[PDB]
Design a protein around this nucleic acid. Structure first.
Ligand SMILES: [K+]
Ligand SMILES: [K+]
Ligand SMILES: [K+]
Ligand SMILES: [K+]
Ligand SMILES: [K+]
Ligand SMILES: [K+]
Length: 523
RNA sequence: AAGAAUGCAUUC
């Protein structure tokens, strides 16, 4: 049936003159049909062979063949009007009348208005499906945080304890709904920032033209990223939401964050293993990081990078010198006589002068991810040696500073990756520095501690293959039989700790770090 | 391990 609808749709969208009402009516009729169909398909699940259960494919086809093509149709209309404005500007320039150029804001606003009405319809549709999926069936595998983000309450409704496969299908449908909501909002924000806003006034047009985007327009994407984050909270093994967050950061020229999220996409447990890696490789092959490095080293610049952004640029250029030498290597230098050693020294100094746990966690993901992607033994060994020089600097900082989350992450990276542990324990400075760091801590723990709930880093790295999909420095057995799921997303709101949560988490992290670090040093 | 060059690292 979806094929018939997509045929009729493509016939409609191919007309020279678009009937907005006809399209919206047709979408509303198709949505009503699909809704009654999927409700009935879940209802009859236990009556037909499971492999005849079609809802996931039907939903995927509705998005890819019906709803997204309509989005792309509207985007193409916006682009047509934008190019008309560009043609008018070029004509006025070549005719010697540059001040006579005027943006026409009408017919950008009309197209966008029809587009917005369509977006409102599908936003309501996917939210309606998400609410149905989430509240019709009791599912202990849905965190109460997910429910509270949407103000959903689950009634005394259908209990499908009989079938865990059924509940897995239902949460996958909810995940698809959230993904579609993030995707439609991301497309809407892109269209607003690249076509509508520039066509509002000459000021907007010329600022869009001169500054490529210098996109600080992350505010336009906050809602879409929220939906992607909910996707990840629901099923962190699936790679698409991570990739879409990386796409958003790439479009706002936050290239390092893009690389980070593309790597997280690549390393999720059930990743398709292509989208993130291809997007990251396309970034690395380009000139943004080398140009950024030149601008930083020359000092004077309109760029005005923050210290964290400077560290990020340094890190990518240093990793690229080894991993992508055809772009980041000319003799001892990365670009334009800028030596690898100088940049390495500068970044390592900033580890201590500008320590930041989130910044360092992202650095570690990026450098050990690039290690994981490197096939050549010489390249891989050089990258590991660089990564462990970085880690040695981090441990030196930890002799006098605090970074328990970073330390947990480092130790678990070592624990879940035997070749990395072997390299680490063969470096005298790694052993010496880790010993000095651990001697700062006091702990009566001798075995893996237990705890009330997952912490921030546990939630953040769920189903990341860099740590073999979970931290293993706690005995979390009591948290994993899921007739509840709140501890796994770290929701301690149900636990009676008040502000002492911070003290509790610090003590527990310290215990886990002491026990695991002694394990590592004993090998 | 040396030896050489560039700013402990990188390069042959
Ligand atoms: K699934
Ligand atoms: K986030
Ligand atoms: K992209
Ligand atoms: K993509
Ligand atoms: K950055
Ligand atoms: K926490």
């Amino acid at each position: 049936a979806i094929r018939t609808y997509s045929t009729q749709l493509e016939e409609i969208l191919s007309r020279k003159f678009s009937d907005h009402s006809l399209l919206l009516g047709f979408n509303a009729s198709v949505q009503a049909k699909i809704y009654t169909w999927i409700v009935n398909d879940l209802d009859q699940y236990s009556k037909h062979p499971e492999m005849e259960f079609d809802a996931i494919g039907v939903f995927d086809k509705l998005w890819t063949d019906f709803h997204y093509p309509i989005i792309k149709f509207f985007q193409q209309q916006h682009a047509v009007v934008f190019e008309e404005q560009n043609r008018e500007l070029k004509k006025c320039q070549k005719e010697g009348r540059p001040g006579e150029f005027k943006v026409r804001p009408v017919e950008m606003r009309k197209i966008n208005d029809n587009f917005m009405k369509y977006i409102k319809e599908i936003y309501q549709f996917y939210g309606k499906l998400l609410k149905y999926f989430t509240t019709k069936y009791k599912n202990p595998n849905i965190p109460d945080k997910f429910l509270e983000e949407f103000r959903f309450t689950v009634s005394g409704n259908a209990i499908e304890c009989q079938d865990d496969n059924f509940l897995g299908h239902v949460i996958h449908l909810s995940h698809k709904c959230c993904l579609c909501l993030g995707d439609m909002l991301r497309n809407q924000a892109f269209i607003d920032t690249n076509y509508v806003v520039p066509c509002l006034s000459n000021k907007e047009f010329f600022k869009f033209k001169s500054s490529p985007n210098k996109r600080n327009h992350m505010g336009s994407y906050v809602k879409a990223i929220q939906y992607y984050n909910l996707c990840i909270m629901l099923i962190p093994a699936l790679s698409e939401p991570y990739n879409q967050i990386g796409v958003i950061y790439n479009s706002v020229d936050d290239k390092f964050n893009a690389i980070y999220w593309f790597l997280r996409s690549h390393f999720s447990r059930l990743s398709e293993h292509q989208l993130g890696f291809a997007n990251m490789s396309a970034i690395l092959k380009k000139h943004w990081f080398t140009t950024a490095l030149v601008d930083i080293v020359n000092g004077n610049s309109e760029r005005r990078f923050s210290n964290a952004n400077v560290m990020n640029v340094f890190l990518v250029c240093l990793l690229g010198y080894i991993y992508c030498p055809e772009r980041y290597k000319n003799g001892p230098n990365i670009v334009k006589k800028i030596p690898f050693s100088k940049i390495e020294t500068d970044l390592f100094k900033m580890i201590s002068s500008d320590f930041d746990e989130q910044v360092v966690l992202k650095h570690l993901v990026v450098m050990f991810g690039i290690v994981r992607l490197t096939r050549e033994d010489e390249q891989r060994d050089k990258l590991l040696r660089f990564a462990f020089r970085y880690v040695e600097k981090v441990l030196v900082y930890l002799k006098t500073g605090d970074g328990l989350m970073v330390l947990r992450f480092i130790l678990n990276l070592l624990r879940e990756n035997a070749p990395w542990l072997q390299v680490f324990t063969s470096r005298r400075n790694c052993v010496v520095y880790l010993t000095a760091v651990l001697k700062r801590f006091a702990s009566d723990s001798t075995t893996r501690p237990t705890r009330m709930f997952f912490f921030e880093e546990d939630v953040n790295f769920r189903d990341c293959s860099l740590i073999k999909y979970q931290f293993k420095d706690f005995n979390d057995e009591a948290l994993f039989s899921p007739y509840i799921a709140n501890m796994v997303v770290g929701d301690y709101s149900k636990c009676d700790l008040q502000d002492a949560v911070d003290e509790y988490v610090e003590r527990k992290r310290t215990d886990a770090v002491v026990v695991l670090g002694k394990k590592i040093l004993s090998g």
